[PDB]
């Protein structure tokens, strides 16, 4: 297995320097507003300005900085484009967060050298189309790919071969393990567990009564080099849309525009796929849910969806006396 | 099949004299206002002075300008109609509420002949009279159209059976304009082609009639004249019971969605009455107003607490497999016993 992990360097602060390019070199800190620090760039992170410290402690440390409010949805749109460009590179992708993604590339590359070169082409593509630099980590599982990027950041790329994994197992501090908090690691330090190998010299049940069962199996499985968590690529089983009407209605020719608008948004919100089932969904005046559907053994063209949704909505009006408040469509069973 | 049709005589006008008994013999008309509007229903006594239902009000203010005029008390009429329809479901499992004052009942499996249908129809008239002080008209025949025809000839406060033998006679002798679903203009188009009775529709070719009366009524008329018009009584039954609630803010924290989700369970189980579902579905409306849904089926019944615990883990599966923020959350229950 070959995992490729992509992490966007100080994402929030980096997006701010893209849209306003005057903040080069100057320390930039994004904050949630009295408040807390959301993200700081490398320039400000070098002086102990981390994420999670209060704003006024950060303005003690460096008053001559640029402080920006949290523009969360600005940063989400850039992230959405970059994730879309990563999906372009391999089908098996897991979006872990707004600035983290895991790619399974076992079928695209044969070794770590080709994986390294593929990560180089990913970094340049992201830099070409969004002017964002990233850190790429490559290893044998998700955890070690993340460890790789933590060691190479910022603007880095690092492979961790299988022999460096066995070295890191004996040498990496427990605190440096992804998915493990700082207080859980402080509890392990106080009991004699400092390195990842130290979990091999303790009984499973004893460690379980210490940090819980989820973390106990997590730590032991990594120390054993038997951590095999797959890339969880999310697939939409159904694609649809529900739209609210201006008034509650039972007139078919008034509901049809809203129902047809839901089709247009839904049919063209799954790239290259055709459905075999259509479901019309009505939310009644009392906010109940009534729905009727049909399955076609062949595909449902968009025009078929037009004439079939009307017959399904007609079937809803005949079998229910309540007025309809919102109307929508759901597509499923893709081929 | 034996259909039993019930029609409330001048309902809006009659229910009003139930609440005010001083209108004995006094002409009363109920009107819908929309400046002014039109007359909704008129009673027996005003109906004899050229004041009928459907025509404006001030048109009535030259023909009967000193009779009682009353505004629309729609909510009272609706509540009276609903009790009567509920009283009717006691008599028949299959019923179709066609409008505020008309309901069809299929009683084929409750009576054996038309004489027993007559006795059942008479006791229905006397139960509606004793519990709501409303007189109704009853029509009994083999389908909806002839059950209504029977009522239209027996009204008001009437009960009439139309034998299988009088159906065939009415096909030959009943005027075309008296057929439900067609009006004067369409009936006039037929009278000048040679079509004056229902039986005359069979005695000339299809597609000439079809290309002059419209197609939908062409097959309707011929269906009746062949006495193979057997459209069943469309009884409405609620497949599923549920509720979807809007949240004040889009979120993805299970602990914050849980209250809204639990509210939708409490409302659903109060609307179930003495019903117990075997299937539960959690429905989530995401921020882009997409629908994500997951369900479970239980061979036995679903408690209210199972629903509490099963909805949480269903919402967990939704949150587990969809990255979008949740805007609305709800439950629905199906597969009743």
UniProtKB/Swiss-Prot annotation, chain A:
Main location: cytoplasm
Keyword DNA damage: yes
GO biological process annotation, one example: DNA-templated DNA replication
GO cellular component, one term: cytoplasm
Domain of life: Archaea
Catalytic-site annotation from UniProt: 100
Site (Substrate discrimination): 12
EC number: 2.7.7.7
Domain UmuC: 3-181
MF annotations from Gene Ontology: damaged DNA binding; DNA-directed DNA polymerase activity; magnesium ion binding
Temperature dependence: Highly active from 35 to 95 degrees Celsius. Thermostable.
SUPFAM superfamilies: DNA/RNA polymerases (SSF56672), Lesion bypass DNA polymerase (Y-family), little finger domain (SSF100879)
Chain's role: Poorly processive, error-prone DNA polymerase involved in untargeted mutagenesis. Copies undamaged DNA at stalled replication forks, which arise in vivo from mismatched or misaligned primer ends. These misaligned primers can be extended by PolIV. Exhibits no 3'-5' exonuclease (proofreading) activity. It is involved in translesional synthesis.
Designated name of the protein: DNA polymerase IV
Species of the source: Saccharolobus solfataricus (strain ATCC 35092 / DSM 1617 / JCM 11322 / P2) (Sulfolobus solfataricus)
Underlying gene: dbh
């Amino acid at each position: 297995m070959i995992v490729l992990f992509v992490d966007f360097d100080y994402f929030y602060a980096q997006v701010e320097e893209v849209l306003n390019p005057s903040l080069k070199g100057k320390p930039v800190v994004v904050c949630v507003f009295s408040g807390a620090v959301a993200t700081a760039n490398y320039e400000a992170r070098k002086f102990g300005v981390k994420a999670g410290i209060p704003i006024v402690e950060a303005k003690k440390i460096l008053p001559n900085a640029v402080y920006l409010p949290m523009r969360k949805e600005v940063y989400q749109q850039v992230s959405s484009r970059i994730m879309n460009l990563l999906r372009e590179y391999s089908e098996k992708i897991e979006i872990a967060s707004i600035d983290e993604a895991y790619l399974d590339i076992s079928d695209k590359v044969r070794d770590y050298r080709e994986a390294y070169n593929l990560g180089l082409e990913i970094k340049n593509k992201i830099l070409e189309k969004e002017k964002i630099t990233v850190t790429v980590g490559i290893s044998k599982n998700k955890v070690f790919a993340k460890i790789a990027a933590d060691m190479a950041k910022p603007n880095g790329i690092k492979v961790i071969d299988d022999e460096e994994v066995k070295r890191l197992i004996r040498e990496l501090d427990i605190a440096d393990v992804p998915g493990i908090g700082n207080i859980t690691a402080e509890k392990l330090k106080k009991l004699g567990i400092n390195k990842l190998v130290d979990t091999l010299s303790i009984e499973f049940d004893k460690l379980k009564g210490m940090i819980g069962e989820a973390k106990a199996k997590y730590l032991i499985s990594l120390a054993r080099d038997e951590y095999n968590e797959p890339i969880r690529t999310r697939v939409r089983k159904s694609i649809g849309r529900i739209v609210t009407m201006k008034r509650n209605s039972r007139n078919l020719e008034e509901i049809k525009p809203y129902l047809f608008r839901a089709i247009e948004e839904s049919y063209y919100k799954l790239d290259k796929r055709i459905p075999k089932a259509i479901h019309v969904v009505a939310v009644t005046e009392d906010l109940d849910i009534v729905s009727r559907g049909r399955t076609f053994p062949h595909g449902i063209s968009k025009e078929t969806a037009y004439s079939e949704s009307v017959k399904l909505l007609q079937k809803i009006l005949e079998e229910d006396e309540r007025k309809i408040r919102r109307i929508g469509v759901r597509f499923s069973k893709f081929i």
